[PDB]
JSON list of C-alpha atoms (C1' of nucleotides) in Angstrom, two decimals:
[
{"chain": "A", "resi": 1, "resn": "UNK", "atom": "CA", "xyz": [29.19, -6.22, 17.03]},
{"chain": "A", "resi": 2, "resn": "UNK", "atom": "CA", "xyz": [31.15, -5.47, 13.35]},
{"chain": "A", "resi": 3, "resn": "UNK", "atom": "CA", "xyz": [33.80, -8.69, 14.13]},
{"chain": "A", "resi": 4, "resn": "UNK", "atom": "CA", "xyz": [30.39, -11.13, 13.64]},
{"chain": "A", "resi": 5, "resn": "UNK", "atom": "CA", "xyz": [29.69, -9.69, 10.94]},
{"chain": "A", "resi": 6, "resn": "UNK", "atom": "CA", "xyz": [32.71, -9.64, 9.31]},
{"chain": "A", "resi": 7, "resn": "UNK", "atom": "CA", "xyz": [31.78, -6.07, 8.63]},
{"chain": "A", "resi": 8, "resn": "UNK", "atom": "CA", "xyz": [34.64, -3.46, 7.90]},
{"chain": "A", "resi": 9, "resn": "UNK", "atom": "CA", "xyz": [33.09, 0.08, 7.14]},
{"chain": "A", "resi": 10, "resn": "UNK", "atom": "CA", "xyz": [35.30, 0.87, 4.25]},
{"chain": "A", "resi": 11, "resn": "UNK", "atom": "CA", "xyz": [31.94, 1.67, 2.01]},
{"chain": "A", "resi": 12, "resn": "UNK", "atom": "CA", "xyz": [30.00, -1.29, 3.46]},
{"chain": "A", "resi": 13, "resn": "UNK", "atom": "CA", "xyz": [26.13, -1.90, 2.31]},
{"chain": "A", "resi": 14, "resn": "UNK", "atom": "CA", "xyz": [24.27, -3.57, 5.02]},
{"chain": "A", "resi": 15, "resn": "UNK", "atom": "CA", "xyz": [20.24, -4.31, 5.08]},
{"chain": "A", "resi": 16, "resn": "UNK", "atom": "CA", "xyz": [17.26, -4.19, 7.61]},
{"chain": "A", "resi": 17, "resn": "UNK", "atom": "CA", "xyz": [14.21, -5.41, 7.69]},
{"chain": "A", "resi": 18, "resn": "UNK", "atom": "CA", "xyz": [11.18, -4.60, 9.70]},
{"chain": "A", "resi": 19, "resn": "UNK", "atom": "CA", "xyz": [9.31, -7.89, 12.24]},
{"chain": "A", "resi": 20, "resn": "UNK", "atom": "CA", "xyz": [5.99, -6.95, 11.52]},
{"chain": "A", "resi": 21, "resn": "UNK", "atom": "CA", "xyz": [3.60, -9.35, 13.69]},
{"chain": "A", "resi": 22, "resn": "UNK", "atom": "CA", "xyz": [3.82, -9.70, 17.23]},
{"chain": "A", "resi": 23, "resn": "UNK", "atom": "CA", "xyz": [5.35, -12.94, 17.22]},
{"chain": "A", "resi": 24, "resn": "UNK", "atom": "CA", "xyz": [8.14, -11.86, 15.35]},
{"chain": "A", "resi": 25, "resn": "UNK", "atom": "CA", "xyz": [9.22, -8.91, 17.22]},
{"chain": "A", "resi": 26, "resn": "UNK", "atom": "CA", "xyz": [9.06, -11.77, 20.63]},
{"chain": "A", "resi": 27, "resn": "UNK", "atom": "CA", "xyz": [11.22, -13.88, 17.95]},
{"chain": "A", "resi": 28, "resn": "UNK", "atom": "CA", "xyz": [13.73, -11.19, 17.05]},
{"chain": "A", "resi": 29, "resn": "UNK", "atom": "CA", "xyz": [14.02, -10.36, 20.98]},
{"chain": "A", "resi": 30, "resn": "UNK", "atom": "CA", "xyz": [14.07, -13.33, 22.02]},
{"chain": "A", "resi": 31, "resn": "UNK", "atom": "CA", "xyz": [17.22, -15.30, 20.01]},
{"chain": "A", "resi": 32, "resn": "UNK", "atom": "CA", "xyz": [17.89, -12.72, 17.07]},
{"chain": "A", "resi": 33, "resn": "UNK", "atom": "CA", "xyz": [18.87, -9.67, 19.74]},
{"chain": "A", "resi": 34, "resn": "UNK", "atom": "CA", "xyz": [22.76, -9.07, 20.23]},
{"chain": "A", "resi": 35, "resn": "UNK", "atom": "CA", "xyz": [22.93, -9.86, 24.01]},
{"chain": "A", "resi": 36, "resn": "UNK", "atom": "CA", "xyz": [21.62, -13.34, 23.41]},
{"chain": "A", "resi": 37, "resn": "UNK", "atom": "CA", "xyz": [24.55, -14.33, 21.09]},
{"chain": "A", "resi": 38, "resn": "UNK", "atom": "CA", "xyz": [27.48, -13.55, 23.27]},
{"chain": "A", "resi": 39, "resn": "UNK", "atom": "CA", "xyz": [28.92, -16.97, 22.15]},
{"chain": "A", "resi": 40, "resn": "UNK", "atom": "CA", "xyz": [30.28, -18.66, 18.88]},
{"chain": "A", "resi": 41, "resn": "UNK", "atom": "CA", "xyz": [27.98, -21.77, 18.08]},
{"chain": "A", "resi": 42, "resn": "UNK", "atom": "CA", "xyz": [30.56, -22.88, 16.66]},
{"chain": "A", "resi": 43, "resn": "UNK", "atom": "CA", "xyz": [33.16, -23.31, 19.33]},
{"chain": "A", "resi": 44, "resn": "UNK", "atom": "CA", "xyz": [33.15, -22.01, 22.90]},
{"chain": "A", "resi": 45, "resn": "UNK", "atom": "CA", "xyz": [34.45, -18.93, 21.68]},
{"chain": "A", "resi": 46, "resn": "UNK", "atom": "CA", "xyz": [32.89, -15.00, 22.67]},
{"chain": "A", "resi": 47, "resn": "UNK", "atom": "CA", "xyz": [32.21, -13.35, 19.22]},
{"chain": "A", "resi": 48, "resn": "UNK", "atom": "CA", "xyz": [32.59, -10.42, 21.25]},
{"chain": "A", "resi": 49, "resn": "UNK", "atom": "CA", "xyz": [36.16, -11.05, 21.15]},
{"chain": "A", "resi": 50, "resn": "UNK", "atom": "CA", "xyz": [37.28, -6.59, 21.67]},
{"chain": "A", "resi": 51, "resn": "UNK", "atom": "CA", "xyz": [37.90, -5.19, 18.57]},
{"chain": "B", "resi": 1, "resn": "A", "atom": "C1'", "xyz": [-97.32, 43.19, -6.58]},
{"chain": "B", "resi": 2, "resn": "G", "atom": "C1'", "xyz": [-101.25, 38.40, -5.44]},
{"chain": "B", "resi": 3, "resn": "G", "atom": "C1'", "xyz": [-99.92, 33.96, -7.63]},
{"chain": "B", "resi": 4, "resn": "A", "atom": "C1'", "xyz": [-97.56, 30.88, -10.34]},
{"chain": "B", "resi": 5, "resn": "G", "atom": "C1'", "xyz": [-93.75, 29.50, -13.45]},
{"chain": "B", "resi": 6, "resn": "G", "atom": "C1'", "xyz": [-88.75, 30.35, -13.94]},
{"chain": "B", "resi": 7, "resn": "A", "atom": "C1'", "xyz": [-19.55, 6.80, -12.77]},
{"chain": "B", "resi": 8, "resn": "C", "atom": "C1'", "xyz": [-16.92, 3.03, -8.49]},
{"chain": "B", "resi": 9, "resn": "A", "atom": "C1'", "xyz": [-12.65, 1.33, -8.59]},
{"chain": "B", "resi": 10, "resn": "C", "atom": "C1'", "xyz": [-7.21, 1.73, -10.10]},
{"chain": "B", "resi": 11, "resn": "A", "atom": "C1'", "xyz": [0.38, 4.06, -9.88]},
{"chain": "B", "resi": 12, "resn": "A", "atom": "C1'", "xyz": [7.15, 1.58, -13.85]},
{"chain": "B", "resi": 13, "resn": "A", "atom": "C1'", "xyz": [9.98, -5.74, -15.68]},
{"chain": "B", "resi": 14, "resn": "C", "atom": "C1'", "xyz": [12.49, -8.69, -18.31]},
{"chain": "B", "resi": 15, "resn": "G", "atom": "C1'", "xyz": [16.57, -11.09, -20.86]},
{"chain": "B", "resi": 16, "resn": "G", "atom": "C1'", "xyz": [21.36, -10.50, -22.44]},
{"chain": "B", "resi": 17, "resn": "C", "atom": "C1'", "xyz": [26.54, -7.65, -22.48]},
{"chain": "B", "resi": 18, "resn": "G", "atom": "C1'", "xyz": [30.04, -4.76, -19.77]},
{"chain": "B", "resi": 19, "resn": "C", "atom": "C1'", "xyz": [31.91, -2.12, -15.22]},
{"chain": "B", "resi": 20, "resn": "G", "atom": "C1'", "xyz": [32.59, -1.17, -10.45]},
{"chain": "B", "resi": 21, "resn": "C", "atom": "C1'", "xyz": [31.40, -1.88, -5.17]},
{"chain": "B", "resi": 22, "resn": "G", "atom": "C1'", "xyz": [31.61, -4.94, -1.24]}
]
RNA sequence: AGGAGGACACAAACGGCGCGCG
């Protein structure tokens, strides 16, 4: 996943938000889950390119 | 003798300057 975030682990801060309501949980699991974003929307190129 | 009477509630903010990190 670190490729998608452009996340180098050299002291990189990152934020967490908790979806509260039912629809928020379902929307997260259906649209924003890691396994639902294996293709880049900018071109037909995987974002899970091996590290 | 008889007889008569008699207090509930209530938890810290806004603008600069500087530095630093992603």
